[PDB]
Amino acid sequence: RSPPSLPSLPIIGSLMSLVSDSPPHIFFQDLQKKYGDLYSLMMGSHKLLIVNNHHHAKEILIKKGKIFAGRPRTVTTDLLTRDGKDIAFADYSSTWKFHRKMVHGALCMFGEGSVSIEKIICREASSMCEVLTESQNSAVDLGPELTRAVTNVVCALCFNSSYKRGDAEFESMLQYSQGIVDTVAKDSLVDIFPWLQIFPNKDLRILRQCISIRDKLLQKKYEEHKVTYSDNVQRDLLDALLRAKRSSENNNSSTRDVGLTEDHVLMTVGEIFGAGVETTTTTLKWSIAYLVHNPQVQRKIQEELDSKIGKERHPQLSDRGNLPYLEATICEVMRIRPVSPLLIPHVALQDSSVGEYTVQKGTRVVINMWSLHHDEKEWKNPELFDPGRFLNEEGDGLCCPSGSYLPFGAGVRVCLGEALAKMELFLFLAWILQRFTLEMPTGQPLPDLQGKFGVVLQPKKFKVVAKVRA
Amino acid sequence: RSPPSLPSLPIIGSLMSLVSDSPPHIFFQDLQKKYGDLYSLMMGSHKLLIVNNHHHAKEILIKKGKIFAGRPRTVTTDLLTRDGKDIAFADYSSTWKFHRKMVHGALCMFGEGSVSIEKIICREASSMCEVLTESQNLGPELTRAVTNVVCALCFNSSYKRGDAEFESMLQYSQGIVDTVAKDSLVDIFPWLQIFPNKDLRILRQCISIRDKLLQKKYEEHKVTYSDNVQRDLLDALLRAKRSSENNNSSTRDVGLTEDHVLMTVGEIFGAGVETTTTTLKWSIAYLVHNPQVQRKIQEELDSKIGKERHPQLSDRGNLPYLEATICEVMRIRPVSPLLIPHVALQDSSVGEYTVQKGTRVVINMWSLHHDEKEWKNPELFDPGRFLNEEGDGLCCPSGSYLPFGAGVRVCLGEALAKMELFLFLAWILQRFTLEMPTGQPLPDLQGKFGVVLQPKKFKVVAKVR
Ligand code: HEM
Ligand code: HEM
Ligand SMILES: C[C@]12CC[C@H](O)CC1=CC[C@@H]1[C@@H]2CC[C@]2(C)C(c3cccnc3)=CC[C@@H]12
Ligand SMILES: C[C@]12CC[C@H](O)CC1=CC[C@@H]1[C@@H]2CC[C@]2(C)C(c3cccnc3)=CC[C@@H]12
Ligand SMILES: [Cl-]
């Protein structure tokens, strides 16, 4: 009782069956017309299970979470993460669980005396909004001005620093990062046939180059932090990891079987950094896009902000319960352009089963989040940006419209930075829309909504201007 | 400009206008009939503003949260909290912000390496379900299960079944709950603490028991402390206290006195016991009154967890019916029907009416959660209020729903309460059905008003399934 499979050849597998012009997620969606909502294929030696139904997905992620909690190893992700010593791409282990806890706790604990990431997010939203007022005349494209704000929130979190406006070594970070996003967990020949390392591989060479840069900047932050370290303060996530590593070397019963080598410390912090930039910036950019496209959504948000916050005061995180239309718009942005249309593979750790079907140990289960959030059977008009999907009868609050909505995934490997991302999206969006309304420059056209595919689904460059008032 | 007001005399105020056999929350809800959804009174010298409308409540707690973030000083709470060095009754200050964050962090970080508050909740759930598999022959068993969660979180210990220290703490706690933040007369008129007042004698006594037990735990922790471990919330506060003494320049405004550390840990302990136990006891009551709800939870458990493994926290999104049931329990019997006063730190306004600096704004959580304008058949227990159309997931039925409060003074242990309620109810109902001894009637739902509306004891006996 195995699920339908694509045709397989012996070494190759099903690769001859999966050449298309569509991006991998819509391709795997359209394949449901032939193979149903749940089906397998073979990428070289490795068996893939593609999951398009949310009942199956919640069975993978929740019911049988630890079971499908394995991560696959891959040459690109092995390099990115020093052979899986991060959190995503790290195999289900007490090491993975511990590092998740440390990131969680460092976020709860950031800012020593009353100060928190709320302060940092508000500082950076403020600094940005004051550059947008000061350049309403001279257009100035937000996006990079927004990317710096987001990067600074997570930069504060991880290394207790920030990038100056117009900083040289920031744009170098953006550049190497985009290089990594280009070349990592896109299924390429070396990721399918690892022995192709014996030949020259172009994208492996540029990936390795971007990693070298990152590794330089990480080691620089690492050794600085070590010299200036004190037990009286936990400045940032890196201090909390250094404290933990110290305890590991003092032999406490706690952290004895938990990986806290130098590698682990660096990859964890590096990971949170890269995540915090590429995920939140991407999501905000989609927000910006769908707001330019749907100015009646801009206005209804602004009218809400006028009612519950506006004038005399800027939006605070205590306002979180009280701005349901803004909340719903963010839900809808996450739903319509999922940040990862194909989730990282959930590898089967033992033999198990998914809804009537058998699932062989070691199989790579790929949840098709696109198909979950765009299924016409659970979402009406799936290409329509309607924040009302997530509102209650009156607009007093939110309703889950569908069981299929898994914006931060679920279960055991649920997004580590969910709470953070919610703070950033809420605060940045509310701060901007409080004072500004977003428009397209002169009589230019509305942005293209088809996404540059990868590990993250990112939009094509907008160039969008902010004109007061709101 | 000023809101309606009950008649007040000098000195006593509106007392004696407000004599009643009604519980205070209900009494104030019915006064709406004459004064409307928002009205003031005078309790002795101090001005109360009763808020019954969710729009007004949200303006108090959210839109103007920092303005109305003051707490009143009261001779009972003062004794309970060493003159406001805890969190709940601490005045709005950087100290308050800092102790909240500390508690959040210690909760996030609990018990490094192979230990999480999930595993502790699950452990105590297992202990309780082993004892309930002495089937056909509860209450105090669930109380101790709950106590062990917050006991590990705060002190890294536990009460075994039978400990004298455990019953010892339950009785001093009850004495404290029967006396604090009730309008004693000595609270209304603080000067008559120069007389024999027997409610202060019950307090002080219950408090010296408590402080003996805190200082033992504190001195034991001090003598076993290490900088490499962090065992619990108390270690966290000791670490902060040390760094503060070493002139960490950020934790300077904040107070990390011996008193601050003791009042914070003691509060989290008290809170974790009384609030979670009360809410779980109400759950049990309503489940006994509604066994078809029990059955619908049980069939959800079977078809989304199964029978070979026990409930895990990772099932958070996957049991809508049970979570909607918990919402309705929190709705129909608020843990604090009347809430601690939100004192105005400066002159302000609440929906057109003016509000005087110093006035003590009391949110009537009962009237928010039983307003016929916003809830249909408010005394009807129905978890389907919180379900969506297809029952696939949750859905907000009213903006009047504020079970953990909102804004700046929002509940500190909300995350902890949700873990506790979710796991214990799931663990229990996966293996049992709650019936009563067949020669009994369905339990009293009226309950005892104090700082935490607690139901009256009822001797339940859960059958296996
Ligand atoms: C802004 C919107 C975001 C969305 C919609 C989102 C969504 C998700 C999703 C769907 C997953 C996959 C879970 C799985 O494979 O089962 C995930 C994983 C992850 N997210 Fe996010 N995320 C976001 C932001 C962030 C941020 C800001 C961080 C910052 C650190 C972060 C850290 C992670 C990590 C570490 C994982 C891997 C967890 C693990 O393997 O245990 N995410 N996220
Ligand atoms: C089980 C159900 C619980 C409910 C329904 C509940 C509800 C509430 C409410 C309504 C408030 C007042 C919020 C406000 O004034 O805006 C509050 C405050 C508080 N709760 Fe809870 N609570 C629960 C459990 C807990 C637990 C387990 C703790 C454990 C530490 C806790 C600790 C607190 C504290 C410290 C405050 C005071 C916050 C402050 O003054 O800043 N609660 N809770
Ligand atoms: C490659 C990149 C982004 C480019 C950075 O230079 C390196 C990096 C580190 C961790 C990656 C991240 C992209 C998003 C990833 C893949 C992911 C993620 C994806 C979606 C939501 N939340 C988290 C967790 C790890 C994250
Ligand atoms: C008096 C008592 C309960 C009796 C204990 O012996 C001492 C104690 C400590 C703090 C109090 C708590 C009852 C509930 C209180 C009043 C409160 C609370 C109330 C409702 C929801 N969440 C928290 C936080 C402080 C809590
Ligand atoms: Cl949200």
**Cα–Cα distance for residue pair A241/A259, rounded to 1 Å:** 11
Other Cβ atoms less than 10 A from the Cβ of B196: the count is: 8
Phi, psi (deg, nearest 5) at residue B375: -130, 145
Tokens of A328: 């719903």
Q: Rounded to the nearest 5 degrees, what angle is found at the Cα of A333, between the Cα atoms of A329 and A336?
A: 130
Tokens of B279: 């809410």
Locus of tokens 């699920």: A3
Burial of A73 (0-12, 13-18, 19+ CB in 10 A): middle
Ligand positioned closest to the Cα atom of B88 = 2
Is there a binding annotation on residue A415?
Answer: yes
DSSP string, A200-248: --HHHHHHHHHHHHHHHHHHHHHHHHHHT--TT---SHHHHHHHHHHHH
Pick the closest to residue A292 from A145, A444, A446 (CA basis). Answer: A446
For B212, the 3-state DSSP assignment is: helix
Burial of B12 (0-12, 13-18, 19+ CB in 10 A): middle
Whether residue A296 contacts residue A420, with contact meaning beta carbons closer than 8 Å, is answered with no
What's the first-to-final CA gap in chain A, in angstroms? 59
Distances (CA, A) of A134 to A164, A438, B202: 17, 16, 64
B73 touches chain A (CB under 8 A): no
Q: Name the residue ranges covered by the structural domains of chain A.
A: 1-470
332-371 in chain B: CB under 8 A from chain A: none
Whether residue B322 contacts residue B283, with contact meaning beta carbons closer than 8 Å, is answered with no
Of all residues in chain B, the one with the smallest CA distance to A307 is B63
Phi, psi (deg, nearest 5) at residue B38: -150, 115
Q: Which residues have CB under 8 Å from B267's CB, separation 6+?
A: B81, B86, B87, B88
Whether residue A365 contacts residue A353, with contact meaning beta carbons closer than 8 Å, is answered with no
Is there a binding annotation on residue B342?
Answer: yes
Write down the number of H helices and E strands in chain B. Answer: 15, 8
Sign of CA dihedral B109, B112, B114, B115: negative
Q: Fill in the amino acid letter for B259.
A: D
Pick the closest to residue B87 from B248, B338, B255, B293 (CA basis). Answer: B255
Locus of tokens 């590794």: A215
Q: Rounded to the nearest 5 degrees, what angle is found at the Cα of A276, between the Cα atoms of A274 and A278?
A: 65
Of the partner residues B105, B228, B318, the one whose CB lies closest to the CB of residue A108: B105
| β-pair partners for B360 | B48, B343
Of the partner residues B105, B113, B395, the one whose CB lies closest to the CB of residue A399: B395
d(CA B252, nearest CA chain A) in Å: 7
Q: What spacing in Å lies between the alpha carbon of B9 and ligand 1's midpoint? A: 61
Whether A334 lines ligand 3, by a CB cut-off of 6 Å, is no
Whether residue A282 contacts residue A454, with contact meaning beta carbons closer than 8 Å, is answered with no
CATH topology of domain A1-470: Cytochrome p450 (1.10.630)
Tokens of B68: 């109305």
| β-pair partners for A40 | A5, A49
Angle between helices A202-227 and A262-293 (to 10 degrees): 110
CB pairs under 8 A between A and B: 158
Ligand positioned closest to the Cα atom of B410 = 2
| β-pair partners for A452 | A458
Tokens of A431: 């701060």
Is there a binding annotation on residue B71?
Answer: yes
Pick the closest to residue A74 from A212, A188, A232 (CA basis). Answer: A188
Locus of tokens 């400990």: B163
A254–B111 C-beta distance less than 8 A: yes
**Cα–Cα distance for residue pair B12/B4, rounded to 1 Å:** 18
B397 touches chain A (CB under 8 A): yes
Q: Residue A105 is inside which H or E element, if any?
A: helix A94-109
For B306, the 3-state DSSP assignment is: coil
Distances (CA, A) of A40 to A189, A289, A357: 19, 35, 11
Distances (CA, A) of B124 to B127, B406, B463: 5, 30, 19
**Cα–Cα distance for residue pair B360/B291, rounded to 1 Å:** 42
For B144, the 3-state DSSP assignment is: helix
Is there a binding annotation on residue A320?
Answer: no
Q: Which residues have CB under 8 Å from A374's CB, separation 6+?
A: A29, A382, A383
Tokens of A379: 């979402």
For A70, the 3-state DSSP assignment is: strand
406-435 in chain A: CB under 8 A from chain B: 406, 410-412, 414
Long-range Cβ pairs for the range B166-171 (8 Å, 24+):
B168/B209, B169/B209, B169/B213, B170/B140, B170/B143
Tokens of B426: 């799931």
Pick the closest to residue A359 from A68, A69, A73 (CA basis). Answer: A68
**Cα–Cα distance for residue pair A24/B35, rounded to 1 Å:** 64
Q: Which residues have CB under 8 Å from B201's CB, separation 6+?
A: none
Other Cβ atoms less than 10 A from the Cβ of A211: the count is: 21
For B70, the 3-state DSSP assignment is: strand
Q: What spacing in Å lies between the alpha carbon of A421 and ligand 1's midpoint? A: 9
**Cα–Cα distance for residue pair A341/B227, rounded to 1 Å:** 44
CA atoms within 13 Å, Cβ hemisphere of B32 = 18
Q: Which residues have CB under 8 Å from B241's CB, separation 6+?
A: B256, B260, B261
Helices (H), B109-197: 117-132, 140-155, 164-177
Tokens of B36: 């409307």
| β-pair partners for B51 | B38, B363
Tokens of A154: 């997570």
Q: Residue B450 is inside which H or E element, if any?
A: none
What radius of gyration, in Å, describes the C-alpha atoms of chain A? 23
For A342, the 3-state DSSP assignment is: strand
Gaps in chain B (C–N > 2.5 Å) come after which residues?
137
CA atoms within 13 Å, Cβ hemisphere of B368 = 27
Whether residue A213 contacts residue A219, with contact meaning beta carbons closer than 8 Å, is answered with no
DSSP string, B372-402: TTTSSSTTS--GGGSB-TTSSSBB-S-TT--
Chain centroid to CA B363 = 15
Whether residue B225 contacts residue B238, with contact meaning beta carbons closer than 8 Å, is answered with yes
Is there a binding annotation on residue A413?
Answer: yes
| β-pair partners for A438 | A466
Tokens of B161: 């079944």
Of the partner residues A66, A258, A321, the one whose CB lies closest to the CB of residue B406: A321
A312 touches chain B (CB under 8 A): no
**Cα–Cα distance for residue pair B383/B381, rounded to 1 Å:** 7
B246 touches chain A (CB under 8 A): yes
Whether residue B365 contacts residue B460, with contact meaning beta carbons closer than 8 Å, is answered with no
Whether residue A59 contacts residue A38, with contact meaning beta carbons closer than 8 Å, is answered with no
| β-pair partners for B387 | B394
Resolution reading in Å: 3.0
Tokens of B25: 């929350």
Whether B460 lines ligand 2, by a CB cut-off of 6 Å, is no
Strands (E), A46-119: 46-51
Other Cβ atoms less than 10 A from the Cβ of B102: the count is: 24
Q: Which residues have CB under 8 Å from A436's CB, separation 6+?
A: A129, A132, A466, A467, A468, A469, A470
Q: To the nearest 5 percent, what fractions of chain A are helix, strand and coil?
A: 50, 10, 40
247-286 in chain A: CB under 8 A from chain B: 247, 250, 252-258
Tokens of A46: 């490795």
For A27, the 3-state DSSP assignment is: helix
CA atoms within 13 Å, Cβ hemisphere of B351 = 15
Tokens of B156: 């890294």
Sign of CA dihedral B84, B419, A272, A461: negative
B119 touches chain A (CB under 8 A): no
Locus of tokens 């409307």: B36
For A466, the 3-state DSSP assignment is: strand
Q: Which CATH superfamily does the domain covering B1-465 fall into?
A: Cytochrome P450 (1.10.630.10)
Of all residues in chain B, the one with the smallest CA distance to A311 is B63
- Name the pairing type of β-strands A465-468 and A436-439: antiparallel
Ligand positioned closest to the Cα atom of B406 = 2
Phi, psi (deg, nearest 5) at residue A147: -60, -35
Tokens of A29: 């969606």
Q: Residue B49 is inside which H or E element, if any?
A: strand B46-51
Pick the closest to residue B84 from B263, B262, B339 (CA basis). Answer: B263
Please name the residue whose Cα sits nearest to atom 14 of ligand 4: B271
DSSP string, B254-296: S---HHHHHHHHHHHHHHHHHHHHHHHHHHHHHHHH-HHHHHH
| β-pair partners for A50 | A39, A366
Q: Which residues have CB under 8 Å from B375's CB, separation 6+?
A: B331, B369, B385, B397, B398, B400
**Cα–Cα distance for residue pair A135/A146, rounded to 1 Å:** 14
Q: How many residues does chain A have?
A: 470
Of the partner residues B94, B243, B392, the one whose CB lies closest to the CB of residue A400: B392
Whether residue B57 contacts residue B367, with contact meaning beta carbons closer than 8 Å, is answered with no
**Cα–Cα distance for residue pair A462/A151, rounded to 1 Å:** 19
DSSP label at A13?
B
DSSP label at A391?
B
Q: Best mutation site among B451, B453, B454 for ligand 4, i.e. most ligand atoms within 8 A of its Cβ?
A: B451
DSSP string, A141-202: -BTHHHHHHHHHHHHHHHHS--PPTT-HHHHHHHHHHHHHHHHSSS--HHHHSGGGGGS--H
Tokens of A170: 């920031």
**Cα–Cα distance for residue pair A132/B357, rounded to 1 Å:** 38
Other Cβ atoms less than 10 A from the Cβ of B70: the count is: 21
PDB experimental method:
X-ray
Phi-psi region of A146 (alpha: psi -120 to 50; beta: other; left: phi over 0): alpha
Whether residue A284 contacts residue A425, with contact meaning beta carbons closer than 8 Å, is answered with yes
